[PDB]
């Protein structure tokens, strides 16, 4: 019972923290907080709490398959999003490398490309041995 209650409380908290961001979506914090990366990270957290139900259930072919494929993904989404956000913060932190003009800035579009590549590596790695 207790893991299920913990997961329900966590999913309620995640719902609140995502509805707030969807509701405002204009304040400077949300804008400068990497909206796409934040949404990907929150989706990963959302998927993280569902896996307790697949673990607590009775073993089965489809259930074991879901466990295997989703366990790595739940961590991979969150940590890839955090890695991309940290890379953006680091690139802003120092400035002016040994080159003219503005320091390189990761664009909102490129963040999705890097995050999805890092996720897809784990996806294919899981699928091969699945």
């Amino acid at each position: 019972v207790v893991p299920v209650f913990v997961a329900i409380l966590g999913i309620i908290a995640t719902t609140f923290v995502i509805v707030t961001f969807v509701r405002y979506n204009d304040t400077p914090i949300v804008r400068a907080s990497g909206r796409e990366l934040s949404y990907v990270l929150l989706t990963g957290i959302f998927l993280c709490y569902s896996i307790t139900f697949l673990m607590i259930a009775a073993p089965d072919t489809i259930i074991c398959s879901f466990r295997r494929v989703f366990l790595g993904l739940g961590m991979c989404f969150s940590y890839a999003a955090l890695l991309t956000k940290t890379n953006r913060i680091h690139r802003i932190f120092e400035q002016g490398k040994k080159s003219v003009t503005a320091p390189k800035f990761i664009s909102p579009a490129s963040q999705l490309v890097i995050t999805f590549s890092l996720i897809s590596v784990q996806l294919l790695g899981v699928f091969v041995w699945f």
Partner: protein, 340 residues
Amino acid sequence: TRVFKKASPNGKLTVYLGKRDFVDHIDLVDPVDGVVLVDPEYLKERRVYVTLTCAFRYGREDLDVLGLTFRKDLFVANVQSFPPPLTRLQERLIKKLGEHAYPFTFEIPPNLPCSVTLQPGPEDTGKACGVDYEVKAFCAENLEEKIHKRNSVRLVIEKVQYAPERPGPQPTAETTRQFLKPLHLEASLDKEIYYHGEPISVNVHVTNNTNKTVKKIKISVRQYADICLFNTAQYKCPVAMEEADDTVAPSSTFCKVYTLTPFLANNREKRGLALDGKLKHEDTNLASSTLLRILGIIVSYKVKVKLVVSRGASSDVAVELPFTLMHPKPKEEPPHREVP
């Protein structure tokens, strides 16, 4: 015997000032004196107000995608002029002008920021980023309600600092790096305070007791800018560089002198590089160092010496030396234009 005047679009209201640069001594700043000439018949029951305002504006390339800009007024002062200690210039102007001349004087609090403009980009159109000051004289029935464009005169004024008269200590640095017998690096400059356009000479002395070999020596001059009003990262950028292929063999010493000079000709593509205050879109040199003894951009300058020793993947051994880059106090006020 040469003052600056500006008139409102109608021509009824005129503003006279004696200077455009006001020097900061860290303790107390030159007061802003001025005279205003009005037309009593033009204004039935209105008043003439003067104001002094300091403005800070900042934006960056990554924040433009998100649509964010930052603005704030650091200091605002208001005086009432038409219905009234006179300095010599104000008395002489009132004597030269008629009875409708009335003075105003402003005292800028100390420890306020200087005038700084960040280099614009190719497609920047409007007002630049940085911190600036302006005086604005207008006619209105009340201060808090409305300011018409026709009854308003605006002038830009620069608050500036100049090089200290007493030189400081010689800048020197030393480092020791022992790997998994040490490598010992020493660097020094000739003087602490440099003037714009003057060369910087750095003397390096490396002793290598290790079995390693230094391949390259990289020397650079770098600028740091602190935007410290909102929660904003510091801007850092190299403004001069020199890479030398000098090898320091194991069990050997080495000593050399290098000369560098930062200037704007090769640094014109660096968007966001700090520059001295501008009245207009004219050219100004690199920004001068700030003497603190805040609230806006703070400029600093350093020299960096790096050794690239790899053997074996390459490791770096580096030192830094701060310095000051300023203008000497001139006998004549700067023109704020291209003279020839």
